[PDB]
Amino acid sequence: SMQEEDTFRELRIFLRNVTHRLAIDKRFRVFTKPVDPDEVPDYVTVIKQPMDLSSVISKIDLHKYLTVKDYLRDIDLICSNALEYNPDRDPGDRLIRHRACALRDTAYAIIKEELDEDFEQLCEEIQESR
Numbered sequence: 001s002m003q004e005e006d007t008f009r010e011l012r013i014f015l016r017n018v019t020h021r022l023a024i025d026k027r028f029r030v031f032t033k034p035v036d037p038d039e040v041p042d043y044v045t046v047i048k049q050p051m052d053l054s055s056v057i058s059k060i061d062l063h064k065y066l067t068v069k070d071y072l073r074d075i076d077l078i079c080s081n082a083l084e085y086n087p088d089r090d091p092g093d094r095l096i097r098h099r100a101c102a103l104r105d106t107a108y109a110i111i112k113e114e115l116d117e118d119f120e121q122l123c124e125e126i127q128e129s130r
Helices: 002-023 026-031 053-061 068-085 091-114 117-128
Strands: none
Touching (some): 002 053, 002 068, 002 091, 002 117, 053 068, 068 091, 068 117
């Protein structure tokens, strides 16, 4: 229905806003674009499902997220990829993992404060009906 389409549009608007707020945070710069294979040639062989905040915006605009849960799976993937690709005690690895964790915790904290649970439940019930 039109009302359901309005619901998913409202979802996309919310997701774009959250994603922008993550993308402008200096700590999360490393997560804002896909890894450049020229810079990091073994990346795509170790990490099977790359994800970044630019790709997240593209996916919002492609209507790939019909729930906040779906979105958070991609935020989680950004974080888990960083953890897997940079697992060493070295400070470069530790910094990125700390930032990856902060990206994830920040997204979740925003959503906890700003997403109405009934709005999410509505999205989920529309998605389930399709």
